[PDB]
Amino acid sequence: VTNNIVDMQVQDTLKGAANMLGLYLEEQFGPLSLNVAGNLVDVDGRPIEGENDYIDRLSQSMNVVATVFAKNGNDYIRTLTTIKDDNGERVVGTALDSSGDAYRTLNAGGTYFGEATILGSAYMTGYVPLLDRTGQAIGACFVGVSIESVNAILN
């Protein structure tokens, strides 16, 4: 019973947080676009990289990790993220695994909710397309909870 409750809580958290992230970006930046170099920019053409205040707040309040990807070609590059490597640096510049179903789902214009590996470890994830004012996909928003964190709750 409690295990199923925890699983449903994780899923509800991710559904809520994935849509909140899109709303947070709209509040922070307004509509986003890609510049010639393939970087996410606001209406003024100002790049968003390093402006992590809202995504950090979302991560803290919903207890998720979170990422905003830029779409370059069919690839998705982490632009804003709360995921960190062992040295404490945010994993900006890493890419979504091109062999995974989350990548295929996003390139097909869909959303992905399910388990996925990120940089070597397993997470429960939500990946949602990010669109510009014309409806064109310019990236993706992601929220996740590590399987390690889920197992810690269950124990």
Interface residues with Na ion (CB under 5 A)? 97, 99-100
CB of 145 to Na ion, least distance (A): 19
- Of 144, 133, 124, residue with least CA distance to 43: 133
Smallest separation, CB 97 to Na ion (Å):
5
> By C-beta, is 73 or 120 nearer to Na ion?
120
Q: Shortest approach of Na ion to residue 112 CB, angstroms? A: 12
- Cβ closer to Na ion: 99 or 155? 99
By beta-carbon proximity to Na ion, the closer residue of 6 and 122 is 122
Q: Which residue's structure tokens are 């996909």?
A: 137
Query: Smaller CB distance to Na ion: residue 28 or 94?
Result: 94
What is the chain's alpha carbon radius of gyration, rounded to the nearest angstrom? Answer: 15
- CA dist 147 → 27, 82, 84, 118 (Å): 30, 16, 16, 11
Interatomic CA distance for residues 114 and 151, integer angstroms: 16
Residue located via tokens 């179903």: 101
Residue facing Na ion at closest CB distance: 100
Question: Residue 43 CB, nearest distance to Na ion (Å)?
Answer: 35
Give dist(CA 112, CA 13) in Å, integer.
15
